[PDB]
Design an enzyme around this catalytic site. Structure first.
Site, PDB file in Angstrom:
ATOM      1  N   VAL A 157      -8.049   8.413   4.331  1.00  0.00           N
ATOM      2  CA  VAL A 157      -7.706   7.631   4.203  1.00  0.00           C
ATOM      3  C   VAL A 157      -7.638   6.616   5.896  1.00  0.00           C
ATOM      4  O   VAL A 157      -7.816   7.063   6.653  1.00  0.00           O
ATOM      5  CB  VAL A 157      -6.638   6.767   3.700  1.00  0.00           C
ATOM      6  CG1 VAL A 157      -5.989   6.683   2.691  1.00  0.00           C
ATOM      7  CG2 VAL A 157      -5.475   6.547   4.730  1.00  0.00           C
TER       8      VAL A 157
ATOM      9  N   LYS B 205      -4.687  -9.468  -7.574  1.00  0.00           N
ATOM     10  CA  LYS B 205      -5.765  -8.992  -6.473  1.00  0.00           C
ATOM     11  C   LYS B 205      -6.764  -8.165  -7.232  1.00  0.00           C
ATOM     12  O   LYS B 205      -5.812  -7.363  -7.964  1.00  0.00           O
ATOM     13  CB  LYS B 205      -4.466  -7.745  -5.931  1.00  0.00           C
ATOM     14  CG  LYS B 205      -4.995  -8.327  -4.218  1.00  0.00           C
ATOM     15  CD  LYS B 205      -5.949  -7.199  -3.543  1.00  0.00           C
ATOM     16  CE  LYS B 205      -5.712  -7.128  -2.816  1.00  0.00           C
ATOM     17  NZ  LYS B 205      -4.831  -6.368  -1.460  1.00  0.00           N
TER      18      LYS B 205
ATOM     19  N   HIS C  51      -2.964  -2.564   8.171  1.00  0.00           N
ATOM     20  CA  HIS C  51      -3.986  -2.656   7.667  1.00  0.00           C
ATOM     21  C   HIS C  51      -5.327  -1.576   6.616  1.00  0.00           C
ATOM     22  O   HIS C  51      -5.328  -0.609   7.423  1.00  0.00           O
ATOM     23  CB  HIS C  51      -5.140  -3.378   7.615  1.00  0.00           C
ATOM     24  CG  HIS C  51      -6.449  -3.816   6.905  1.00  0.00           C
ATOM     25  ND1 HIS C  51      -6.576  -4.913   6.450  1.00  0.00           N
ATOM     26  CD2 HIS C  51      -8.000  -3.202   6.794  1.00  0.00           C
ATOM     27  CE1 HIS C  51      -7.828  -4.772   6.012  1.00  0.00           C
ATOM     28  NE2 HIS C  51      -8.596  -3.834   6.564  1.00  0.00           N
TER      29      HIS C  51
ATOM     30  N   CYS D 274      -5.866   1.046  -8.236  1.00  0.00           N
ATOM     31  CA  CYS D 274      -5.471  -0.402  -9.036  1.00  0.00           C
ATOM     32  C   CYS D 274      -6.846  -1.190  -9.815  1.00  0.00           C
ATOM     33  O   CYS D 274      -6.556  -1.863  -8.330  1.00  0.00           O
ATOM     34  CB  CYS D 274      -4.220  -0.943  -9.135  1.00  0.00           C
ATOM     35  SG  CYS D 274      -2.883   0.085  -9.273  1.00  0.00           S
TER      36      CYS D 274
ATOM     37  N   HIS E 227       0.612  -1.728   0.069  1.00  0.00           N
ATOM     38  CA  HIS E 227      -0.509   0.117   0.166  1.00  0.00           C
ATOM     39  C   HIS E 227       0.769   1.163   0.341  1.00  0.00           C
ATOM     40  O   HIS E 227       0.145   2.202   0.352  1.00  0.00           O
ATOM     41  CB  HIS E 227      -1.430   0.462   1.008  1.00  0.00           C
ATOM     42  CG  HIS E 227      -1.942  -0.858   1.395  1.00  0.00           C
ATOM     43  ND1 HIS E 227      -2.884  -1.425   0.544  1.00  0.00           N
ATOM     44  CD2 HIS E 227      -2.191  -2.413   2.050  1.00  0.00           C
ATOM     45  CE1 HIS E 227      -3.903  -2.391   0.877  1.00  0.00           C
ATOM     46  NE2 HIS E 227      -3.029  -3.270   1.174  1.00  0.00           N
TER      47      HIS E 227
END
Length: 121
Positions: free
Chosen positions: A101, A38, A112, A79, A11
């Site tokens: 975020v 993914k 996470h 993505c 990330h």
């Protein structure tokens, strides 16, 4: 620790170039998220310092059941997998964004990323 390290691997990308489809298909392979492909993955750009601070009240607030939501906005790139197979070759569509975020913190470190906020179904 290992979880924070892994978080950074799937990330975080400090300074990407064009955040286009090619960028996605390349960073997804680079970060090893292509086997299987993914379905969707978001990368945060900027300095790590700001990301870690989301775990403290300096740049974050409690969110939902056990997450933290950043106070500052971050440049990000999502993505999204295009096509019907979860196996390479993985074609991705990129979407550059800029907003706060949501992460989960463990011992003061982001471990996470809640990617739900980046998928508009």
């Amino acid at each position: 620790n290992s979880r924070y390290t892994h978080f950074l691997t799937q990330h975080y990308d400090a300074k990407p170039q064009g955040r286009d489809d090619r960028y996605c298909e390349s960073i997804m392979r680079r970060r090893g998220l292509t086997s299987p492909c993914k379905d969707i993955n978001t990368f945060i750009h900027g300095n790590k310092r700001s990301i870690k601070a989301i775990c403290e009240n300096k740049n974050g607030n409690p969110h939902r059941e056990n997450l933290r939501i950043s106070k500052s906005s971050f440049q990000v790139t999502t993505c999204k997998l295009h096509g019907g197979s979860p196996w390479p070759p993985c074609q991705y569509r990129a979407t550059a964004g800029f907003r706060n975020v949501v992460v989960a913190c463990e011992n003061g470190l982001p471990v996470h990323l809640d990617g739900s906020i980046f998928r508009r179904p």
